[PDB]
Amino acid sequence: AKWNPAGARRPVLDEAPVFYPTEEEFEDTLKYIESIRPMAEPYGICRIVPPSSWKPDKSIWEGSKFSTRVQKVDKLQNRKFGFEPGPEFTLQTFQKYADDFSKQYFVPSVEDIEGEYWRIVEVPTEEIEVIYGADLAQSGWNLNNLPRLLVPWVYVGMCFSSFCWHVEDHHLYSLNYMHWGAPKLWYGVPGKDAVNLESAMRKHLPELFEEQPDLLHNLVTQFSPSLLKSEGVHVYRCVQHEGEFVLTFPRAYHAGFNCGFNCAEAVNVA
Ligand SMILES: O=C(O)CCC(=O)C(=O)O
Ligand SMILES: [Fe+3]
């Protein structure tokens, strides 16, 4: 359908911490991580901007194919059993599709998009669907090297495509790098608040748990940070741009969505 600027329901949240490692600190991923852990841990999420040094093909772009899942954004939180399959794309074709979706729906700022996104999930006025592809030097920052010192997965997102609330498989971290494209909005909740979040969800969305007692492992439910906040849950926003990492901590709840066509890669680790 279309944007509705005056119906924006943008969450009012504290920012998660940002880290600007120096070239030295940056030569050992695992170590730098341990080093920021004490200050970042209490937020459950943090963002990491690589130093100037750090730098990260036509026929992959044009040729390599992947499949997608369909998401009904208006039904991620409010509904009376998830993401059906969608068409096959290439990056090239996905982008043309993604860009057109946005151009028609709306150039908005991130807060414009964020305000609309939560409007769509908290108070939708129209069905709205969206597609995404998921699970497709020398240093651990090149995520293919980290299992060494579990494998890296790739994610193609578009405006409004979502990763719904969850905690990583075990007590695992996850490290996420944004290769190219539009910003990814993240919401993070500290490990010590896992209880408050699940109980907040059970409280407000009782019906669902009834009919899917295992919601929390299904990755199929978005839940407003404003509602979390009302219940005393600490939620920290962060905005990941192209070329940046987002670090997720053990037992830390996290969710978000994309502000447009983008491509990102993530791995778990302890
Ligand atoms: O962005 C996604 O679709 C995946 C989210 C996730 O599970 C993670 O990497 O922490
Ligand atoms: Fe995750």
Numbering used by the authors: 139 to 194, 200 to 223, 262 to 287, 296 to 325, 350 to 362, 378 to 498
Task: Quote what the paper states about this structure.
In this work we have identified a rice histone demethylase, namely JMJ703, which specifically demethylates methylated histone H3 lysine 4.
The crystals belonged to the P63 space group with a slight change in unit cell parameters among the three crystals. The unambiguous electron density denoted Fe(II) (determined by inductively coupled plasma mass spectrometry) bound to c-JMJ703 and identified the active site within the JmjC domain. Three key residues, H394, E396, and H482, are perfectly conserved in JMJD2 proteins. They chelated Fe(II) in the active site through their hydrophilic side chains. Y321 and N404 showed significant conformational shifts compared with their counterparts in c-Rph1 and c-JMJD2A.
